[PDB]
């Protein structure tokens, strides 16, 4: 379907968009006490894999799944909350602020770099077709 460069750069754009979405969702839920069921929000992470279609030669980036972080959930002593345990510590998400801003900046700069790569390739693509005519 897609040309190889198109597929690689578009996969890069989609992967960076997914990472930015995960960062934004984490930054929104930084102060959430409960979900829809009664469990604390867990910071999400996105794992980049190389989609090496040929044997070890090249390939874009794919995202296998969005994993839930395994870090000590923040404990805040609020015994009056219905979600407090026997000891009374309500669970707050493990979303760090600085890491998510850094992730947003890095995802934006990778997105823009891949956009520039596509823009650069495009002129050569259109100029290839003048070879025959």
């Amino acid at each position: 379907a897609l040309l190889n460069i198109f597929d690689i750069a578009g996969s890069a754009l989609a992967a960076q968009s997914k990472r930015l979405n995960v960062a934004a969702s984490n930054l929104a839920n930084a102060d959430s006490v409960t979900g829809p069921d009664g469990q604390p929000y867990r910071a999400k992470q996105v794992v980049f894999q190389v989609d090496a279609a040929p044997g070890q030669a090249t390939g874009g980036v794919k995202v296998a799944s969005v994993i839930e972080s395994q870090a000590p959930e923040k404990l805040v002593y609020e015994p009056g909350n219905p979600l407090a345990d026997a000891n009374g510590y309500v669970k707050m998400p493990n979303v760090d602020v600085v890491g998510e801003m850094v992730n947003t900046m890095s995802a934006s700069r990778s997105y823009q770099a891949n956009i520039e790569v596509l823009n650069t390739v495009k002129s050569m693509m259109l100029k290839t077709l003048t070879l025959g005519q």
Binding site: A1, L3, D7, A53, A57, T128
Partner: peptide, 13 residues
């Protein structure tokens, strides 16, 4: 060969 060209159709068929 091992590397497909940039202007080739997606290696993934």
């Amino acid at each position: 060969g091992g590397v497909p060209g940039a202007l080739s159709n997606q290696p993934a068929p």
